[PDB]
Design a protein around this ligand. Structure first.
Ligand SMILES: [Cl-]
Ligand SMILES: [Cl-]
Ligand SMILES: [Cl-]
Ligand SMILES: [Cl-]
Ligand SMILES: [Cl-]
Ligand SMILES: [Cl-]
Ligand SMILES: [Cl-]
Ligand SMILES: [Cl-]
Ligand SMILES: [Cl-]
Ligand SMILES: [Cl-]
Ligand SMILES: [Cl-]
Ligand SMILES: [Cl-]
Ligand SMILES: [Cl-]
Ligand SMILES: [Cl-]
Ligand SMILES: [Cl-]
Ligand SMILES: [Cl-]
Ligand SMILES: [Cl-]
Ligand SMILES: [Cl-]
Ligand SMILES: [Cl-]
Ligand SMILES: [Cl-]
Ligand SMILES: [Cl-]
Ligand SMILES: [Cl-]
Ligand SMILES: [Cl-]
Ligand SMILES: [Cl-]
Ligand SMILES: [Cl-]
Ligand SMILES: [Cl-]
Ligand SMILES: [Cl-]
Ligand SMILES: [Cl-]
Ligand SMILES: [Cl-]
Ligand SMILES: [Cl-]
Ligand SMILES: [Cl-]
Ligand SMILES: [Cl-]
Ligand SMILES: [Cl-]
Ligand SMILES: [Fe+2]
Ligand SMILES: [Fe+2]
Ligand SMILES: [Fe+2]
Ligand SMILES: [Fe+2]
Ligand SMILES: [Fe+2]
Ligand SMILES: [Fe+2]
Ligand SMILES: [Fe+2]
Ligand SMILES: [Fe+2]
Ligand SMILES: [Fe+2]
Ligand SMILES: [Fe+2]
Ligand SMILES: [Fe+2]
Ligand SMILES: [Fe+2]
Ligand SMILES: [Fe+2]
Ligand SMILES: [Fe+2]
Ligand SMILES: [Fe+2]
Ligand SMILES: [Fe+2]
Ligand SMILES: [Fe+2]
Ligand SMILES: [Fe+2]
Ligand SMILES: [Fe+2]
Ligand SMILES: [Fe+2]
Ligand SMILES: [Fe+2]
Ligand SMILES: [Fe+2]
Ligand SMILES: [Fe+2]
Ligand SMILES: [Fe+2]
Ligand SMILES: [Fe+2]
Ligand SMILES: [Fe+2]
Ligand SMILES: [Fe+2]
Ligand SMILES: [Fe+2]
Ligand SMILES: [Fe+2]
Ligand SMILES: [Fe+2]
Ligand SMILES: [Fe+2]
Ligand SMILES: [Fe+2]
Ligand SMILES: [Fe+2]
Ligand SMILES: [Fe+2]
Ligand SMILES: [Fe+2]
Ligand SMILES: [Fe+2]
Ligand SMILES: [Fe+2]
Ligand SMILES: [Fe+2]
Ligand SMILES: [Fe+2]
Ligand SMILES: [Fe+2]
Ligand SMILES: [Fe+2]
Ligand SMILES: [Fe+2]
Ligand SMILES: [Fe+2]
Ligand SMILES: [Fe+2]
Ligand SMILES: [Fe+2]
Ligand SMILES: [Fe+2]
Ligand SMILES: [Fe+2]
Ligand SMILES: [Fe+2]
Ligand SMILES: [Fe+2]
Ligand SMILES: [Mg+2]
Ligand SMILES: [Mg+2]
Ligand SMILES: [Mg+2]
Ligand SMILES: [Mg+2]
Ligand SMILES: [Mg+2]
Ligand SMILES: [Mg+2]
Ligand SMILES: [Mg+2]
Ligand SMILES: [Mg+2]
Ligand SMILES: [Mg+2]
Ligand SMILES: [Mg+2]
Ligand SMILES: [Mg+2]
Ligand SMILES: [Mg+2]
Ligand SMILES: [Mg+2]
Ligand SMILES: [Mg+2]
Ligand SMILES: [Mg+2]
Ligand SMILES: [Mg+2]
Ligand SMILES: [Mg+2]
Ligand SMILES: [Mg+2]
Lengths: 173, 173, 173, 173, 173, 173
């Protein structure tokens, strides 16, 4: 138009926010896939299921806050296909945790690149938005997943018969 | 394996449930797109936004109940890409309502075909599942959208300046 | 003295904060003028009046937080005349909303320049202060005013006899 | 128009009310300046600060009641620049109290002149308004400031090191 | 390893965080020393004691939040000796306040250098951490100590017999 | 002076109390180090972390009660550097427990020597202070750590993958 609200909002930032929306929705879909893997009759780790379902819902929240930001700043949301996850069968509780850790690091890297772009374009509102709602959340998530991976490895997952069962009930319970 | 739980569950039913999961997730994405269209600064119909956001969340619930059914019956969830909606700019409150009505009829037709398949395969559990949780929900949704379309048309949407504003505040408020 | 508290606080930042204080007080005065325009017997839109009176009080808060910052950092407040608003008769609810939107964008631009100055002077405390309390508040205010302008335009304000009356009662009520 | 509400309201009264509005806003600004003087790190008398901030807010109330009166009687508010206070550095708690006393007497004199004008123009509504809301308030304010000045003088302010500190905590606390 | 959680975290930042941990623990020890100075039988200013004990506990909190950050980011905490304070006998309430002010400015300078390092290394998570939890806290602490120093100087501390006694009971009480 | 409060308080006792203060602060620092070892991403035993953090806070309390005693008896606190712990990486939950047990025995021995000194100097107040607040606390702490070491050894820590995990959740939880 430009939008009557738009101010100090670079087209490159608008496009990068659209890409980030897609990535957050993708992460939501990965965790939804994991949640329902753990409720298979031949897996049946209900607290792993609940843990990943919660993570899925959080990622949808992350996508929505970026969609709201786009509108607030006068950009236009452009949605793209949400790609299916890389797997349907996630192999084990440990493997799912390791894949989640890799996913979160990848999302973090994208957010850091978005922050660098916002800095380059002199957009302190966008920088603050990412710092306030995204960057520390990512650090906490990565740390949590790292803790979980360590405990599962030490306990002898996936092959030690009691490991994932006991972690399911005592850590994720 | 087959799954140690699987009984009277035809592979064609399992595949059709996977297709229905994708369609429910697609419908969820369409309504999410609509929700954020109505919160654009140049649209700003907050109760249309809230209405479609609620519909989006309901469709995710519909997808999840089918995913649970797949696990309950011993089938294996196979996720596919969630296609982007046909539009980002939904034009008006009336146009969004008309598109939602068409979407719901299309989803209904898919559910009726799923029911016919389940009947052909002598799967009364699957027939009952669809009747109990899907078919009446669809009829109620289609009727509601039909009511909304009629009122918006009669009020003179989209061109009559007061129509969508007043419908937003008095029907969807 | 310098102040026994002063540290990493550039004289240019101190002066720019004094200018921003004046601009926030000016904005408060503009909105006070608008508030009392809407309570004229020949205007009588009481919820427009209340809306702008609230905005006026918020701007005084914005001025006071900067005055507090000046003291906290060891700068010295230097007040200047508060210029009268550009108009006493604000013409219509739509015109007042459009003028408020322009005012908020102008204040935003001043805040962005203040942030750039603070960045240039390596003052992260001042940068954070602006990000935490000012920049997102401005984005939200501009978006809100944009929403209001759009609805009033679409409804046919100012000439459509029902438009401002109905917006007063249903949006600002 | 004249206003369809206007009755027995002389143009000279309308103009004098506009002048009084400006004077009340000026007094509000003087007291805001004083409030933030007392929160300087090299002054730090927090109850003097709170006392003057309260007085500032009361003066804005006084301005608003006159603005409301203008509208009630069918006059038209005409705002003018709010002049900056005569000082930024108010020297001491005693000096600020003495300046406040002088300010209140000056405002009182203006109100008495307004009352004499209203009497001359046979406007008993305006006379009653001033008597009901302004004249006794002024007498109480002047008396309070006189009490405070006397105690601070007797205690040995500003040079006696304990005087303003102890008055801050025990009278204004 | 590197740590499986580590991302965008420069070794220089990790080392600087270890140095800051030591400095916060040092500040905690200085304030603990001051707290117990004021409870000597020949000093006996119990509210000065309580004030510095509270400051001591806050500094331990500051150290712990940095230790947590180190773990969150995948760095490794490296503790060093906590040096004893420069004095055991802090001379007077005024002298302790002046020493605390100098200490807080020194800690602030270290935090500003840490922020500049984090900026140089493109670590927005670390920048935000310092802005959110440290930089404004320091500004508030320095301002508070400046206020206290001013009042004690004006009251005639340390030699005026009533000054520290009255400040203890009325400001710190 | 001597202190006007000092009575039956030998200079050797005063010096020994200063040494004990340092040792209690050292023990506090050892346990703080252990607490944050257990929250590393590659250790992640949160109840070991909480257990040692609590022990750290208790040791600071032990130091403060001796500092208070020094003042109560008219002695003068003389603080010294707090040496860093012997390790940053505490190897395992069992190793940390074994090191804590050794530390507590060492502190106990110092307290017994202090008691023998107080007895030699005919200071029954000091003897009672140590008996009332220190000696039984030490016996309880040593016994608790001995219990924990035994269970961890029997369970097969540190190499048995489930041992420290299960002890963390069921004993320290
Ligand atoms: Cl722009
Ligand atoms: Cl795509
Ligand atoms: Cl920037
Ligand atoms: Cl864990
Ligand atoms: Cl590991
Ligand atoms: Cl167990
Ligand atoms: Cl079957
Ligand atoms: Cl596809
Ligand atoms: Cl059947
Ligand atoms: Cl309807
Ligand atoms: Cl129709
Ligand atoms: Cl209506
Ligand atoms: Cl400076
Ligand atoms: Cl000017
Ligand atoms: Cl900076
Ligand atoms: Cl609106
Ligand atoms: Cl528009
Ligand atoms: Cl008249
Ligand atoms: Cl003027
Ligand atoms: Cl009269
Ligand atoms: Cl008085
Ligand atoms: Cl007098
Ligand atoms: Cl007193
Ligand atoms: Cl790294
Ligand atoms: Cl050292
Ligand atoms: Cl950065
Ligand atoms: Cl103070
Ligand atoms: Cl001073
Ligand atoms: Cl003695
Ligand atoms: Cl030493
Ligand atoms: Cl004895
Ligand atoms: Cl035990
Ligand atoms: Cl044993
Ligand atoms: Fe999470
Ligand atoms: Fe959550
Ligand atoms: Fe996310
Ligand atoms: Fe694909
Ligand atoms: Fe794997
Ligand atoms: Fe995530
Ligand atoms: Fe920044
Ligand atoms: Fe921030
Ligand atoms: Fe997360
Ligand atoms: Fe619905
Ligand atoms: Fe619903
Ligand atoms: Fe559906
Ligand atoms: Fe496509
Ligand atoms: Fe259409
Ligand atoms: Fe539907
Ligand atoms: Fe529905
Ligand atoms: Fe209505
Ligand atoms: Fe506002
Ligand atoms: Fe507000
Ligand atoms: Fe503002
Ligand atoms: Fe002018
Ligand atoms: Fe206009
Ligand atoms: Fe504003
Ligand atoms: Fe605002
Ligand atoms: Fe007053
Ligand atoms: Fe009052
Ligand atoms: Fe007044
Ligand atoms: Fe002037
Ligand atoms: Fe004076
Ligand atoms: Fe007054
Ligand atoms: Fe008054
Ligand atoms: Fe007193
Ligand atoms: Fe503090
Ligand atoms: Fe505190
Ligand atoms: Fe600190
Ligand atoms: Fe030394
Ligand atoms: Fe000194
Ligand atoms: Fe500090
Ligand atoms: Fe502090
Ligand atoms: Fe203990
Ligand atoms: Fe305890
Ligand atoms: Fe101890
Ligand atoms: Fe050493
Ligand atoms: Fe060992
Ligand atoms: Fe101990
Ligand atoms: Fe004894
Ligand atoms: Fe005893
Ligand atoms: Fe203990
Ligand atoms: Fe258990
Ligand atoms: Mg326009
Ligand atoms: Mg992508
Ligand atoms: Mg479940
Ligand atoms: Mg079998
Ligand atoms: Mg399909
Ligand atoms: Mg909304
Ligand atoms: Mg000095
Ligand atoms: Mg200006
Ligand atoms: Mg009103
Ligand atoms: Mg007429
Ligand atoms: Mg005047
Ligand atoms: Mg104050
Ligand atoms: Mg690995
Ligand atoms: Mg150092
Ligand atoms: Mg005490
Ligand atoms: Mg004597
Ligand atoms: Mg020693
Ligand atoms: Mg913990």
């Amino acid at each position: 138009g430009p939008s009557r609200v738009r101010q100090n909002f670079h087209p490159d930032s608008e496009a990068a926010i659209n890409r980030q929306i897609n990535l957050e929705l993708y992460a939501s879909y990965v965790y939804l896939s994991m949640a329902y893997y753990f409720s298979r009759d031949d897996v049946a780790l209900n607290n792993f299921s609940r843990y990943f379902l919660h993570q899925s819902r959080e990622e949808t929240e992350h996508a929505e806050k970026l969609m709201r930001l786009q509108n607030q700043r006068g950009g236009r949301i452009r949605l793209q296909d949400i790609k299916k996850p890389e797997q349907d069968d996630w192999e084990s509780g440990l493997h799912a945790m390791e894949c989640a850790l890799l996913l979160e690091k990848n999302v973090n890297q994208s957010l850091l690149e978005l922050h660098a772009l916002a800095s380059d374009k002199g957009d302190p509102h966008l920088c603050d938005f990412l710092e306030t709602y995204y960057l520390n959340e990512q650090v906490k998530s990565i740390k949590e997943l790292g803790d979980h991976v360590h405990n599962l490895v030490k306990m002898g997952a996936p092959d030690a018969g009691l490991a994932e069962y006991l972690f399911d009930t005592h850590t994720l319970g």
